[PDB]
């Protein structure tokens, strides 16, 4: 009789999508990423900065 | 009754459903059949193909008496016998006794052929018949007596 929104009102955000419990509990919104050091070919930075 | 009628409903709308532009006037066409041959030809042709002029022979002082010739098919013919007497003649198909049906008595002038009368013979007294009627009668064993 009244549409309640997920995205606020946790109860129904938790009615659908119980993986909600997991996400919030494990963060994942804020999940870090794997730092890698790979560098671009010196062809790129030539044609990027080029005229 | 007046109380059911749309003209009560039109009280208070100016034209009375008659229209504000083309109004409702006396005789915009002409009266009655006027101009069948001119403006009204599109209605008169179709809707009444055949209206104008003449076709064949006149008749002076015709009398539909002489033409009285009511028609009765062998579709029925058995209706001229009341239903007690009828089933009685139905069973026991024979000559030497067969029902006498006087059709000119029953209001008729001719016997047509519509179809399928039982194998049961009948003597049909009549004024005129079709050749196909009188055949089927003879295929049930019956005959035809011309009368007046």
């Amino acid at each position: 009789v009244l549409k309640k929104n997920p995205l606020k009102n946790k109860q129904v955000l938790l009615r659908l999508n119980p993986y909600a419990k997991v996400f919030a509990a494990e963060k994942l919104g804020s999940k870090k990423a794997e730092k890698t050091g790979t560098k671009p070919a010196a062809v790129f930075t030539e044609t990027l900065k080029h005229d | 009754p007046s109380r059911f009628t749309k003209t009560r409903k039109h009280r208070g709308h100016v034209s009375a459903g008659k229209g504000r532009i083309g109004k409702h006037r006396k005789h915009p066409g002409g009266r009655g059949m006027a101009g069948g041959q001119h403006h009204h030809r599109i209605n008169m042709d179709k809707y009444h193909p055949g209206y104008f002029g003449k076709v064949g022979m006149r008749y002076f002082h015709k009398q539909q008496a002489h033409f009285w010739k009511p028609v009765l098919n062998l579709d029925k013919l058995w209706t001229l016998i009341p239903e007690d007497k009828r089933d009685q003649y139905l069973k026991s198909a024979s000559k030497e006794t067969a029902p006498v049906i006087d059709t000119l008595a029953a209001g008729y002038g001719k016997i047509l052929g519509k179809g399928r009368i039982p194998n049961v013979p009948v003597i049909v007294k009549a004024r005129f018949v079709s050749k196909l009627a009188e055949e089927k009668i003879r295929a049930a064993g019956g005959v035809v007596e011309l009368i007046a």
Partner: protein, 185 residues
């Protein structure tokens, strides 16, 4: 505002109930509306509708058509159902037995069905014996047999018969009906 794909506030244009004020008729509705909803049986929903139809859509089913209907394969032992009135046909000499559920019966049809050992059932009796309408036969009368549908669509070269009072020669047989006068239709 709304770009409207179809006409708004569209009456569904299907008779919701009979236009008739007959109490008994209404009760047959009351019966079959119950049957229709709960029974899940198709035969019921049909008869509900056909209880609404006007005189025009209830053409008289002639007793002989019932004869012929039963001569269908395996169809002798079904019970013929007519929503409408049923009529006596002189033009059959033989008639079968069976059972005819019908809203009305003319004098003769009743006499002709019983005399051959059959049965004239009112429709609620048909509901009692046949709730899901099993082993039933429905027969519609000829609709376009009517004399009005003679004149429908009257046009050049439709051969549709005109609306006219007196008939014969002299009567809409001359111009345009024969190549000898004007054209032909």
């Amino acid at each position: 505002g709304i770009d409207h794909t179809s006409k708004q506030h569209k009456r569904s244009g299907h008779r919701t109930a009979p236009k008739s004020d007959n109490v008994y008729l209404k009760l047959l509705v009351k019966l079959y509306t119950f049957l229709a909803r709960r029974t899940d049986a198709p035969f019921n929903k049909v008869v509900l509708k056909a209880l609404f139809l006007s005189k025009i859509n209830r053409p008289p089913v002639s007793v002989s058509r019932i004869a012929r209907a039963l001569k269908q394969e395996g169809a002798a032992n079904k019970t013929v159902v007519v929503v409408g009135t049923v009529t006596d046909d002189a033009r059959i000499f033989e008639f079968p037995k069976t059972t005819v559920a019908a809203l009305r019966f003319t004098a003769g049809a009743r006499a002709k069905i019983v005399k051959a050992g059959g049965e004239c059932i009112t429709l609620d009796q048909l509901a009692v014996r046949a709730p899901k309408g099993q082993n039933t036969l429905i027969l519609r009368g000829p609709r376009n047999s009517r004399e009005a549908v003679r004149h429908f669509g009257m046009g050049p070269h439709k051969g549709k018969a005109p609306r006219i009072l007196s008939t014969g020669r002299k009567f809409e047989r001359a111009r345009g009906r024969r190549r000898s006068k004007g054209f032909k239709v």
